[PDB]
Amino acid sequence: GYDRHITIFSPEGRLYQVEYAFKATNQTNINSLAVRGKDCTVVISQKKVPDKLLDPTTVSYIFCISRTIGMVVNGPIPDARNAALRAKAEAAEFRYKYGYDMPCDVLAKRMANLSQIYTQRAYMRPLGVILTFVSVDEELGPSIYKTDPAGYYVGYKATATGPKQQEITTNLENHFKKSKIDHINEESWEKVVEFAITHMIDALGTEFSKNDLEVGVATKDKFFTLSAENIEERLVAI
Amino acid sequence: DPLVYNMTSFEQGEITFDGIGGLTEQIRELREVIELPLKNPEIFQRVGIKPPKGVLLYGPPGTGKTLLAKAVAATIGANFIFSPASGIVDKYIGESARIIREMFAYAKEHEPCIIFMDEVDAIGGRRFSEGTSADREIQRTLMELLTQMDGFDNLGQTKIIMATNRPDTLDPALLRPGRLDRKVEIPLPNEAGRLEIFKIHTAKVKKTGEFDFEAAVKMSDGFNGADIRNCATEAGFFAIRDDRDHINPDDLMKAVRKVAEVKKLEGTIEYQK
Amino acid sequence: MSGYDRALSIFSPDGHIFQVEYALEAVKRGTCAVGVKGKNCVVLGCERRSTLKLQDTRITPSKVSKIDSHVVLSFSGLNADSRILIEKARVEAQSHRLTLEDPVTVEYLTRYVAGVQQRYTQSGGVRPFGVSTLIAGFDPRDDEPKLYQTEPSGIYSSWSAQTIGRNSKTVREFLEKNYDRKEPPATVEECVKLTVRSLLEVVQTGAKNIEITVVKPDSDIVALSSEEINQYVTQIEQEKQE
């Protein structure tokens, strides 16, 4: 082995396999982003459509696993759902057992800790995915967390993901050094959306419909997608 | 040997810079360094520089570096040689490496004259403690090169440039500045950088239509720097196959769309930093 | 290799099975041994490879190894594997004596411990017993002497004398010369001077190295004293005078 399996390192002092699993996440050329608020968050994911026989209500990379929680995937789908499913099944446990619903942090203290176990006992290959979460908790406020094939889960002020998480961020961290805020204002669940869409199209410069993009917002006892006719409200600027 | 007396084929012939695009600053980063010693050498003595010795390129292949490797010939009028970093090895040990001494001296007997050297990753290893019975041979073949450019044997008024598609794996002792005093990356350019390259073929052959590029080149975010000469001819390759020997912007589209997916099925292998 | 039938399972194109002939090809590197049955007695013998006079003489783990009053076992080659067969035999002795209300035979014993090895070479995730052994002693209330030899392939074959291990082929040709199915040795001391004498070719006259028991009717088991041995080691050499 040493270049095929996982449970034996290289001679160097690392391994090679899992370093590939990070790479298949970019096997769909999709980009995403997520942000914060006093009471609100946003997530978005540009949607491609080859041959037009699809049912674009059926197409979705998003899985609102529970109330108070939300997530979207990267990489391919089928190896994502099983990472989503036991997640959904787990909230039938923490609630039934420890009284109440899961915060994100306990979840992304958990959904990763077994992904570690999928790289000790190599019988199950590690899941070909990096993966994110959203919520509006009660102590710490709207919190985001990232996850991964090996589990350096991290909280965030915001995120960036795809093949182009180097400059989309650079269109974002540009002003969180200027505005001097991890937080972002315009708390209501609309105004923050245009912020997410205006700064990315500034980084990309491409026009859209309700057809090709989406939405997801974390709100008290709430999480959902919706109608994206508010593409228009950018128009008033120039 | 007579083999050194065979490589030199087109030591002068000018294929100038107008026939190139995308690289208006790399060449600004390179017309700087090479020609000036070989044009006005007292400047580095006017100012007190140990002048450069050595350059290379890097970036993926089929991209136009070898053109640049010869396009400088047009500016100089002076001499040049072409040679790989592959067709050197053989059975008899040292015979591969002796040649290296045979040639730098052969530079000194007629110059202004410089060198090119492809695919140096073959001679581009990290000197290993452990080895096979023979792979250390190239390592001892290498270090002659590592020597002669900056060795005890002083040198001046000759230049080397090399190139790979795999900058890594190299012995850092080569990368010591003094052995080569500036690097550069040639990437797959932007669309406009991909656009001059598109039209130079039309600049030669009988164009018929208006521009019709900006949407054609909307597809051009995938290509390399060299598949388009194929694309350019490929339009007329079958515009004519209907015995229509006056080309159009109608027919290339079937070509330029086509090439992308036949290129896709074995493309985007690696990039090497 | 839980299961996996690594190469024990893989027969050969010649027919053999590699790891088995390999085993008793390894066994010959260990201390020799020997067995004899005469008219009324049965005799055994081994050696101690030369130590530096530190190999603890008192409580050495020896080659003869009792089972009951009327059965013993000697062996050859590997040793850590020897100690379990000695255990899961005498286990069955105390069991056989119990649930049948009468002790063991020997034709019941060699069948077991020759059949056990077959399961340790016709199963998965198991290495054979790189060892070869022999059994010795009487059945109850019977004068008849018996010894049975067995080896890791799982076959047991009776004998009158036999040797195992190192330089046996340098030895057994001496015994077929002297010993004969014609006529036994008379009694105890006869077998021994015949027995010991056969060793001497690989012995460098280390009387300390060699250790002996006998077996007799009514289970009169015993091991013998180095003086009693050494005074055979010499008078036999006194006979060398020619």
Place this chain on the structure above:
Amino acid sequence: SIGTGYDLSNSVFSPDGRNFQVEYAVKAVENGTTSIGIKCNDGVVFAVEKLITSKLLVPQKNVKIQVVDRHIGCVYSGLIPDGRHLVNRGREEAASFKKLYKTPIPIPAFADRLGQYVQAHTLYNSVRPFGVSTIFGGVDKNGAHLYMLEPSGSYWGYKGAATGKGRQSAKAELEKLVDHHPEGLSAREAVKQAAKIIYLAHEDNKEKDFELEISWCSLSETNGLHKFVKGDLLQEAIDFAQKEIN
């Protein structure tokens, strides 16, 4: 993963992050029979080319279709038996749903099961993927659906479908048809519109004859249950579609 490589065994990400032991499969189904899945405006309909490989075969004797509990039609392609396997799991689990939640089975959550059992044959080392490309489409209170199936689990929701050796041929019409009918056809008429495909798709394989079979499920015609179609209906079709292609 060309030799001294990675394609041979499962669950080894080739360095571009791929399981080349999988993408060999989709060539297998590509080296198999043809079949389709269509969304009526009130339900579904399927089809398949049954393949005479000899003269000794009997019409309406050896189908190439199975079925879910009461409604969910399901087809096969490529390899049949591996298909036949999980269809035994199809009828199985939906009963575990029915006994428990006291109702029939919805189709989206259905793929939530069958889109994982196959995924859970991708990730180990000591198994093989299902070499098929399945389709299943049905009906429910929220309307109707159609779902194509790929072995890696990349199931989406289509309005038209295809597979086999005649995909780019066939699915072209499915695109060249629907643009002329944004209405979304009712049941009986999409039938002959689809049989047009198979007697056109077989153009590859003119060494031989063949035949076909048909599915049927809609609200106005079955109460939204699955079945086949016999008598003058499809016989009025096969000559019709055969008539209007010459």
Place this chain on the structure above:
Amino acid sequence: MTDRYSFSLTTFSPSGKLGQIDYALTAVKQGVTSLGIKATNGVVIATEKKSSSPLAMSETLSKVSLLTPDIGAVYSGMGPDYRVLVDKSRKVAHTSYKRIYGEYPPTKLLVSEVAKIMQEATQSGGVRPFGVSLLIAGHDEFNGFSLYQVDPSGSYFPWKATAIGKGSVAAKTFLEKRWNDELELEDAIHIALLTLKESVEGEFNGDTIELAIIGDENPDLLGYTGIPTDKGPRFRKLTSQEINDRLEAL
């Protein structure tokens, strides 16, 4: 299902040195720096995180972690193979020692059982070792303050002042000179602090660093006041300004 009980790592190469072990700790040296030292009256451990990108929060990812109110630890190696075994480790202290007796464990043997978490993994079938060589600090009554290193094999050593990671050798070459047999704390942290700052570029902000100690009880944190047989939690870390005012001293 999972037909690979085939023992990995069980193949002694003929020299006698195991294969993955000497490869595994090839990582931890490639990993970040840390340290932890000892005094007569208190203990300390610290390291730095290297966020590697700005927007990511750097206070949720607690590299230092608690496992008892009297014991605390840190690593420097691989991360995700650390936070899983602590959860086993602290569970043990409830199970193997507490539920059966009542007390919290000493640290002469918590480390022992944490080692047994490790060797059972380098010996079973198809299981890699944990890419970490962490170290724990604790307090007792037969032995009081104490310190221990471990390694992915299981061999735990005791120590007095140690670093492990990237430039640990430079630090082990550093401490012992300006170390003292009775360097009590508030100079210990200083020499400890600067013991890292040499090992780092980028920035040395007070928020960049975590650390903690095991000193003397502090039942202001114990909460449930009204029990004289409930001493204070002897372990407690520090915030990012009370570190950043010992830091203005230098």
Place this chain on the structure above:
Amino acid sequence: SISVMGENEKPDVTYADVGGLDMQKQEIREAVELPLVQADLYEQIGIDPPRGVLLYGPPGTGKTMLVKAVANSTKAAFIRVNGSEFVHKYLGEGPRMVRDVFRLARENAPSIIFIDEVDSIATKRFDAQTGSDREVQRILIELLTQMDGFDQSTNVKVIMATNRADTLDPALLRPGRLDRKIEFPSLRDRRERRLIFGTIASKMSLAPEADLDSLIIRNDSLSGAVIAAIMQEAGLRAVRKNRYVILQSDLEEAYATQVKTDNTVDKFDFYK
């Protein structure tokens, strides 16, 4: 026949055109030319002279150059030789090439020779299982005896040079053959860089209106050959703007030009 060099050419450099490494600028002196020049003073005490040495270090750092000024100041006979030409097509050409060089030295003695690189022909094991890689060892063995076999010479000894100093046999690395070893580390200590910048800079045109400490203390992990590049490139930060003498910001514009490439190579997906 092998060659030798006098005054047809020289390296055309000096002790003054170099600087730093000053403790190495004297250990080398006492081994080589002072014995050649000043003999009696230690033959007052008549100990055997020290002899040819080794000198290693990371690539560059003047491992190859320091010779060049002392070479200019030799007052004895001297060579231009490296290692990887000793090999030849035929078999005995190699060892035959090299027996005579000491005869050539001895035929022209007192003198000394040099090698620019040797690690190709000097390794720990004298590997056995190939008809080729023994014939290099024969080139090792022969000097290993010609060095300190019977009755070698008055001369000082074959001066090594490498990028590495562990691969090769101790039989060569021990007294009587390599009585001194030398390290050439840079370390970026501030005691010397504040000279050798100035050494390299004083020789060359320079505006006395310009910063210089803008980078020294600002950068702390540096080497010895690269630094020529920045104050090489500083000039090239000028003429691009057709400037004829340098300015202060050239160095600041140059500081990250040569150095600042700290770390981005697969950071997150390094080990975790």
Place this chain on the structure above:
Amino acid sequence: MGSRRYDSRTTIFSPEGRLYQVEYALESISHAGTAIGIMASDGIVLAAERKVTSTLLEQDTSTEKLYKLNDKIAVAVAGLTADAEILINTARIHAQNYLKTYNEDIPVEILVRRLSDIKQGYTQHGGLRPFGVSFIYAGYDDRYGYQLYTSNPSGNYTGWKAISVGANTSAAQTLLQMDYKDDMKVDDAIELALKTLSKTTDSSALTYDRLEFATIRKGANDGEVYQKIFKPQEIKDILVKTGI
């Protein structure tokens, strides 16, 4: 699975008829430390020469080349200590089991043929490595009085008089093969140890920190033996009484 998980090289033979993993393991120890054990008439001793001697490394609290089993038996470990704390955890119970059902202490010949029979157990079954270890023993009874044993990673135990292990040992025996009488009081035994160890190791300086040993005696007439591991100060006493 089988074709690519090399679970075959374990628990199999050479064609020349031997084992690799064990002849490797038996060699693998010799990189490690060193220990001895002898058998005086009056009592018993041991010793251990560490190599881990960094100055700030705490080497005074407890020990690692030596352990205990019960109130009458002790050992001298050699190997890797991740593969020592397990079988010991399986040994210490055994005494606390043997007593627990027969209200007496162990006939010491019995337990080594209980510890060896798990070491053998892995190099026949499974595809697992053995414990890379070799042990000494030291114990007392009544049906044999004093004793001393030696083990192996395969499972082959042996009774021996005066023994070394680990490193550089084949001369160590040959360094003492002349010096071993059989009278052998205690205080003419320890002089042999230092006379043994101080002629074989790295540095003849031999800081006490680089050394451990123990002792056994019969101090109460008609009473048990006194397990006593020596501690630094009293180690240092005889260390300098010799005059070194």
